[PDB]
Write a structure and sequence with these properties.
This is part of a larger assembly, with three copies of chain A. The first copy, chain A, is of the alpha/beta class. In chain A, about 25% of the residues lie in helices and about 25% in strands. The structure holds zinc ion (12 copies). Chains A, B, C: Tetrahedron-shaped homododecamer built from six homodimers. Interacts with autophagy receptor Nbr1.
Chain lengths: ~525, ~525, ~525
Amino acid sequence: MQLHGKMTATAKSCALDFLDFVNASPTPYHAVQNLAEHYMSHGFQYLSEKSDWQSKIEPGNSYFVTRNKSSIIAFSIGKKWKPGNGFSIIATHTDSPTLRLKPKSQKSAYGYLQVGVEKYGGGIWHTWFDRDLSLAGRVMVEEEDGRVIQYNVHIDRPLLRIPTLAIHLDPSANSSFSFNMETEFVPLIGLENELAKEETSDNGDKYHHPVLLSLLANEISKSLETTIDPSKIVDFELILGDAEKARLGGIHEEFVFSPRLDNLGMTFCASQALTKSLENNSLDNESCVRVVPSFDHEEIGSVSAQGAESTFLPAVLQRICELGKESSLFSISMVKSFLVSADMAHAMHPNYSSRYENSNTPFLNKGTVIKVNANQRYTTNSAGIVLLKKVAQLADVPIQSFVVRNDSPCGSTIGPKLAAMTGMRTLDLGNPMLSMHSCREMCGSKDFEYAVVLFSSFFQNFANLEEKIIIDEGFSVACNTCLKIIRNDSFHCTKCFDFDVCRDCYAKQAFLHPCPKPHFVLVRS
Amino acid sequence: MQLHGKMTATAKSCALDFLDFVNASPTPYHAVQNLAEHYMSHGFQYLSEKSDWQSKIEPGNSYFVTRNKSSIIAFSIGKKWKPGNGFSIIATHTDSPTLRLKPKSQKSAYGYLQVGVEKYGGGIWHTWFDRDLSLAGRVMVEEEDGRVIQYNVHIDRPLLRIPTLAIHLDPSANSSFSFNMETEFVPLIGLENELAKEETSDNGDKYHHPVLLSLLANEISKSLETTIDPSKIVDFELILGDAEKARLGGIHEEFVFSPRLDNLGMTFCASQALTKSLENNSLDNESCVRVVPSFDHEEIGSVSAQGAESTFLPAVLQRICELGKESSLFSISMVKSFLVSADMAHAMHPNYSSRYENSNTPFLNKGTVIKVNANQRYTTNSAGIVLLKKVAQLADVPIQSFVVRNDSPCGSTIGPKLAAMTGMRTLDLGNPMLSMHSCREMCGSKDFEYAVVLFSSFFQNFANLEEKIIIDEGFSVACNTCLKIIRNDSFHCTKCFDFDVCRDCYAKQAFLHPCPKPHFVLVRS
Amino acid sequence: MQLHGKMTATAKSCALDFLDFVNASPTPYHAVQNLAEHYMSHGFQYLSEKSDWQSKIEPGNSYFVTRNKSSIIAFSIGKKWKPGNGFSIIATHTDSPTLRLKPKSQKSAYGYLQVGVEKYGGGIWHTWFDRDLSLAGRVMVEEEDGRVIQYNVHIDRPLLRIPTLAIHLDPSANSSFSFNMETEFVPLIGLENELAKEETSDNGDKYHHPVLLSLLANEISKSLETTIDPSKIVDFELILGDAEKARLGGIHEEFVFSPRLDNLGMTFCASQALTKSLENNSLDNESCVRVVPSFDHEEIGSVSAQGAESTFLPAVLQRICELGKESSLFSISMVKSFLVSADMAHAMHPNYSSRYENSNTPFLNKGTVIKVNANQRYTTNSAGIVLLKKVAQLADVPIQSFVVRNDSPCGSTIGPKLAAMTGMRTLDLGNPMLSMHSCREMCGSKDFEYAVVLFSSFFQNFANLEEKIIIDEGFSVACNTCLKIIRNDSFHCTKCFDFDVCRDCYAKQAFLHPCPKPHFVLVRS
Ligand SMILES: [Zn+2]
Ligand SMILES: [Zn+2]
Ligand SMILES: [Zn+2]
Ligand SMILES: [Zn+2]
Ligand SMILES: [Zn+2]
Ligand SMILES: [Zn+2]
Ligand SMILES: [Zn+2]
Ligand SMILES: [Zn+2]
Ligand SMILES: [Zn+2]
Ligand SMILES: [Zn+2]
Ligand SMILES: [Zn+2]
Ligand SMILES: [Zn+2]
């Protein structure tokens, strides 16, 4: 694990753990799937929302619930928790701006197979041009008894591309690039001159390309004992993401170049720090409930059945509060609670410095960012700032602040509306980044470790610091296993990229990484 | 109390009581503070929302609850009230369009100290130029044991100013005045050539001017036994308002010239008439609950934790309805209830008559205004109109009506969305005014007394008139003490402005006003 | 007298004396009236211009003359003055941009009483919107024998207002505010629904509102033994000014927020320093004549009977020079004389820094400003600069310099044209300020004391320094009484604002201020 400068071997390892997470999670369906595997690895229990939780949840244990396989709420109940005590909630969203396949996605023009796509969210759509695009999502498959189950599919190869016109044919594109959002924004799946295994149709106008359905059925059948024919695929959501893996960038690997950084970065930080806040025994002394909801559909305004503005968070909080017998315990618990809407913040862009307020704009790798807006697009008030300044004092991490320019529009996060349906005191924070809603996005790499330390300190110290805020009273190489800079020979895996176990861990056989057999060459100094 | 013509000595006294209220309330924090002192003066009890109200509230008494010290809900429960009976609710908002200090508010340019401000709401921003601006808000102060408490601070002096460019330097400003919302809209706090007590920094880039923090700590310490050093100030919301006191204007004092008239006047009218509807004994015969919620954040759309679209009003109404044992009593009580969204209406502007519909536009001092809009930006239907025409018939006050022009946009009030979360029948009314969302605002002075009489009649006669609407069935000088025109010698306070007690009250020693020793000269006729 | 920092207790007292002057002088008629009361308090004698001054003026005494009760020229003749000696002249102007009532000022629209106003000067007219406006001016009153005399009237209350349209009805006003100079710029005096004492006219189309004439007659009759009926009012000039009192602003009270700062600032400084240059005995050794002309109509170009371009200054100077018998003594005296056109200068605006020349732009509270322009809109040459640099060296006050940008227009002051009709060497100076010709204007507070010290030094040392320039040869609390920082207990007047007499002056009974009985509470340290 190469450490170029001021690198501390834990911020890199936390950032490298993010890279494995976001490369395996291109859809909210995959994001929820990867979070829930991490939750059950750390001892969480799945709760069916169809069931009744009166006898299923008890203090001292950790649970998670899932809606539409695309929104997930994980909560850990402290042992000293009574019904009526507050909640420490850190809310993220799993979705990102992208392109979905249309229901009739079959398109063909001039020998080229195209797919008909439709925009999702406010993406920066010129950044999607000339990119290797992968295809991912969930697929409904019929089985022989009539039941239909959901299969998540990842096609990890360059499969689609939206190509630009050449500059010879329109030299005005360098002056200002504009494009029609149908006719010039259609990605290419392949060529139809070479699929002539059968030159018939046998029914007019299939919904999708049969070669696309064959690949979806083949990619599903790789993970099953049986095989799936393409005729049993009923309907799907398919997401186009950037096909290229997220990996560290910069002169000192201080940047993270990644698709879907809009909250895949904070979801990772919120979910990791929920599990990190259970390490020694933070439960058996916790009097609150630590909730991490990772929502869906936040780029279009959360107005859905599983979005943040849905009843998903309030019904889960009421079902936790219905362990007590008094019916007023939900509204009592909300005023003792606190929400952290973890959504990413705008870092300082050096090339566009005029589109920033010059004194309240944060920087990369300088800590997480308290997003403050007077119009309450970000719903941070002073009562939240004092709490999270005390948390940052306890965690010993820096925090920054952000406002927009007054001649600039601001978009609401889920924080204002989650505050409305709960009545819960709240703050909007997030880690700084540049090129938000782009196809490929950039943030700092120290910022992942700073967020996890801050959030785990927020989870562990919420109950003590909540009663101290008085409103409303009466009147150059390290080891991936042990995160330490080594002082001796290094064993370099020639099969991975930057693995580099140490002297002790080489004999300790702790070199588990995605290489089935690694070759460790031993290297001086 | 000078009465120029058709003045009735009670409309002026109600308007003069408003002037004391709005001059002491430049922030929603101060507005809630002044309302709650008026509530506890009239016998209301504070309710902590952290507590359980099953044993704390009983019929025949009056209570108020507060969220974030910036939204307040006061309710009086009638003695004959059962859980399941309706609510008579008059909802206002405490906030106004203004400028907030940024988190990094320190700015300096060319020897001048500036503060970095950020816009709140849709204010008319050219009216803020060349005004004496005061600074007010709430300040979080640390104490020695770590707890942080909220202190409201008022700086009642000309402290800030946004100056225009001189006309010699840009003569085009008279043709059309436009300005950049950062670079030309920065107020001035002072000059830095004369703060040179220490010419160091001792740490790079403090968030605010140290001279500003010294004034905030000094203004706080005036009202405390101890002193506050500026280092213990953690964070604040600071509101810039117009520094100039509200006072009556016009040839006959028929106008009210005031900042923050956007519902400050209705919040005064709704809160006064809630207390005025308890005078003889309106409780001991009341079967409903009279609620006055004064919300926050309504100029940006109420999407907050304490706004109108929050759960603040529905959770309070459910906690009142949870005195009964049946869980369906909340939804039963809503269809027997009625909401009055008291938000100010557009009066007729004589200079801009083309931007008004010539037959449905109200006038100043002609009564409160029923705001009707087909697109339900104002949510008045006919069922509400018949109720409040009957109320105005009982109160003997005039009412008017307002619609917008069809080629004009209309902004939603809190009334439509408070109707949505409650299911409650509702009407949007308010008193007429001109220059809404300006820095200084104008309304009529008789209109304050007309609103209080109408609302107290609405509170006292709701239960009788609610069952009469059938929808959804089966198939020249007066005295400030006694508000009477005197007919004899007048005792004029030479120390106040227009105090003027009478013959009887001079011997009755009832001359309490903000002058520690007044000199009453006796005046013929 | 609160001293926040670097405050010297005399600059504040000079600025507080200005605040009393400008609050009592909203018209040039009131300005001349307040100057002349200050002149006769300091021993000046009134001269009728109808009389002959051959036997009325003698050396060693001070005189003043008045034209149209709106231009005033005060001059002090030294004891050692011979006819033919020079003049030390400091010329200001008494007028400011404002709105005058039309001759047919009665307007009514949609129940509102309006007054028809007409613009005076190049005022920044958007700053007049949403302001409390007072009414002042001179009124011609008939008496029973047919003679008509002039009465100055001040109506010190919010009486008029020009209201803006609300932002809901025209959202484009925030992009660029423009307004028609008749139809949308009509102030409001009151409502006509409540003046129905008589519902007749008795003659078609009276010139003004009868309720306005009743107030003018009532305000006049307050200062007279008899009463005035409104029928005897013949005609008037009535000036709309900002109704709000001038008072110190800023974090350290280093600003002066005031209406009419265009030369009521310099007239105050020129008139005070004329009287301050007589204190010990500056006469009995003075060989020149110290003239302070305060003109009228300078905002429209001084082309009037009492303006600067009139014969008012040259005829007064000739009548002084006609004490000698030689007829050539006037032209001899002009080349030994010097003019100081005291008109206010543009300070540095931090928000509009591009509309300024970055090296020749002065700052607030850094001394008075030598206005230099090549096109002689300001008529300063080098011969004047050397004289007033020597004066500033003697007075020990700083001076600055101003030029306009070359891509910016410049407006002429009275200095170029007063130079033309006299042939007199001259300089244009003034104190720096921002937002010139606004409704409310901002300047520094130390700048008033710096101007008075400079001008009194210019008056006292003119004769010595005029012969040294060789052109054209052969080939925290202080006391208001004693201006000293006190070191002991302070007696705080609870009835005034910031009066605060000291230990010695409390026993000395020297506490004369506008409070008929003050209560002095004694305060530690
Ligand atoms: Zn996002
Ligand atoms: Zn987003
Ligand atoms: Zn490997
Ligand atoms: Zn190791
Ligand atoms: Zn409003
Ligand atoms: Zn509003
Ligand atoms: Zn008084
Ligand atoms: Zn009385
Ligand atoms: Zn001028
Ligand atoms: Zn001027
Ligand atoms: Zn006093
Ligand atoms: Zn004294």
